[PDB]
């Protein structure tokens, strides 16, 4: 029977090995955490670039679509308007039975478009095909840049109303503020989540749960110190967010 | 190639040699007009309770009344004995198309509205140098979807040369919406 | 070896133990994972500089990337060379002495 309980001697080696192991299984945790952060950052950037590439592609697609639609409508107008194109097309077909005005007008409008710099252009139904197409171009580009870039109004708001009202030479700390500081934090979570930056969320750390009284003298030294690290880190975050925005 | 095609090829390849087919062509044109203008001869071949005796007698006597050729009679007796006489006008038109195709095509052709004698001359001479077929008897038409540029079909089926405005336009547009 | 310390647990000391166990599992689920592929991500900007037409914001983003990876590798090589923890290692040593004081009791037999 007692041949059972011979196991009960091996409940002391295990704890020596506990102390020997946990001071190494932890040193091989910080490394993995670093690499975790690297991986998440890289993946975020990659998804950002896939999105921006797809947006550019769909822009140019819609662009050439309208570039064709408007030239076609313009020609459908000019033909029915002008008498000359009729007899010119007659002669064109006749000599073709052994250039037509359609290819000519298309090529002409394209050549006149290729050196326009559509950024410098006018409103939507503005007649000239360049004025018809550059409206779409610029509007689509604006609806593009607002989603993979920050807006100057969001900048100005906080830069002039929020950050520098705290303090100057370094923009030191943040207890000098209203509850609406929390909104600035929310504002943070917009910008980096459209641009695609990966910043550590400090609050993903979790404090300790007490179990027994004998541990009370340790946990507090952690949790107190943790606050001294959680808030401090916060400052070293937001100053950056300010010193891009001055 | 068809049944009426069979009889057509038969009589053509047999009669082109000695018969002076133009003679047969004229006789068959006379027969075709008699068909279209009788309304009893049409009935007559439709007339199913008629004796083959009376039919053969009618034909043999019709020989001695109008112009007539021997192979014509042989063919008529053939379509009698094979019970294939109602196909006569169809084979007649087949032979007309065959011979006039040997000589010269008839073609359809489209515009928007009335063109001019000048460009009409240009059209015919261009289509002649394209065909190089010494006989061409054409058609004029007016369909305004192809806006004004001259679309047509030189009648052989596999050549509908679509010199048009709207067609080239739409083909080009649907082409240049391609990706990159 | 300390993971084979289960059967010396009692139901009054189970959930705590389970917590500990699951805690370690979390750690291990990280580590092996973050050493299995090694480094397959390693993005190459030669492709993206070409495939993109703006090349004005791409540059600043890449700058951020190369500015953070330096500090990551810095911290990594820096930790690869106190008192805040001894206050708990004392608890551990007390527990060790207690467990020896109990195993000696159950080594009479």
């Amino acid at each position: 029977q007692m041949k059972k309980y011979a196991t009960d001697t091996k409940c002391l080696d295990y704890l020596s090995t506990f102390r020997t192991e946990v001071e190494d299984q932890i040193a091989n945790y910080k490394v993995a955490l670093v690499s975790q952060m690297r991986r998440q950052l890289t993946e975020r950037l990659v998804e950002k670039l896939n999105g921006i590439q797809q947006a550019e592609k769909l822009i140019q697609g819609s662009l050439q679509d309208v570039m064709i639609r408007e030239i076609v409508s313009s020609f459908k107008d000019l033909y029915k308007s002008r008498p000359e194109l009729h007899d010119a097309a007659m002669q064109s077909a006749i000599q073709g039975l052994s250039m037509d005005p359609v290819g000519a007008h298309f090529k002409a409008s394209l050549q006149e478009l290729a050196k326009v710099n559509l950024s410098t252009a006018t409103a939507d139904p503005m007649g000239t095909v360049v004025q018809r197409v550059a409206a779409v171009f610029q509007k689509r580009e604006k609806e593009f840049l607002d989603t993979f870039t920050v807006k100057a109004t969001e900048a100005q708001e906080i830069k002039t109303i929020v950050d520098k009202c705290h303090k100057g030479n370094t923009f030191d700390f943040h207890a000098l503020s209203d509850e609406e500081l929390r909104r600035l934090e929310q504002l943070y979570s917009t910008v980096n989540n459209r641009v695609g930056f990966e910043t550590i969320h400090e609050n993903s750390i979790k404090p300790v749960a007490p179990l027994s009284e004998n541990s009370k003298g340790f946990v507090e030294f952690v949790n107190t110190q943790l606050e001294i690290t959680k808030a401090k880190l916060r400052n070293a975050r937001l100053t950056a967010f300010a010193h891009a925005f001055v | 190639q068809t049944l009426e095609g069979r009889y057509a090829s038969a009589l053509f390849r047999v009669a082109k040699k000695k018969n002076q087919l133009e003679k047969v062509y004229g006789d068959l044109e006379s027969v075709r007009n008699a068909l279209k203008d009788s309304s009893e001869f049409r009935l007559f071949v439709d007339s199913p309770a008629v004796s083959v005796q009376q039919k053969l007698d009618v034909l043999r006597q019709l020989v001695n009344r109008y112009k007539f050729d021997p192979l014509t009679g042989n063919l008529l007796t053939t379509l009698v004995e094979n019970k294939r006489l109602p196909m006569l006008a169809r084979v007649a038109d087949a032979f007309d198309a065959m011979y006039r195709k040997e000589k010269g095509e008839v073609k359809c052709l489209v515009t928007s509205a009335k063109p001019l004698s000048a460009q009409q001359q240009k059209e015919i001479v261009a289509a002649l140098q394209n065909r190089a077929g010494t006989q061409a008897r054409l058609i004029i038409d007016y369909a305004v979807s192809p806006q004004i540029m001259g679309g047509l079909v030189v009648r052989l089926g596999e050549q509908v040369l679509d010199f048009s405005v709207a067609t080239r336009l739409d083909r080009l547009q649907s082409q240049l919406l391609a990706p990159l | 070896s300390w993971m084979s310390l289960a059967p010396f647990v009692a139901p009054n000391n189970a959930a705590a133990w389970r917590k500990l166990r699951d805690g370690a599992q979390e750690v291990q689920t990280v580590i092996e994972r973050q050493s299995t592929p090694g480094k397959p991500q390693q993005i190459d900007w030669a492709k993206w500089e070409s495939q993109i037409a703006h090349k004005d914001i791409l540059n600043c983003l890449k700058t951020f990337y190369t500015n953070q990876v330096q500090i990551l590798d810095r911290a990594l090589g820096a930790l690869e060379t106190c008192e805040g923890a001894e206050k708990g290692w004392a608890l551990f040593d007390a527990a060790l002495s207690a467990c020896a004081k109990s195993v000696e009791k159950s080594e009479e037999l």
Binding site: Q53, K57, Q60, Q111, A114, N117 | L172, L176 | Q51, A53
Partner: peptide, 20 residues
């Protein structure tokens, strides 16, 4: 990729030639 005005328009112009 490519840019619209200077590249794509030239390309499409080069694309249109065709008859018969």
């Amino acid at each position: 990729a490519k840019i619209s005005p200077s590249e794509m328009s030239r390309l499409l112009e080069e694309r249109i030639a065709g008859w018969k």
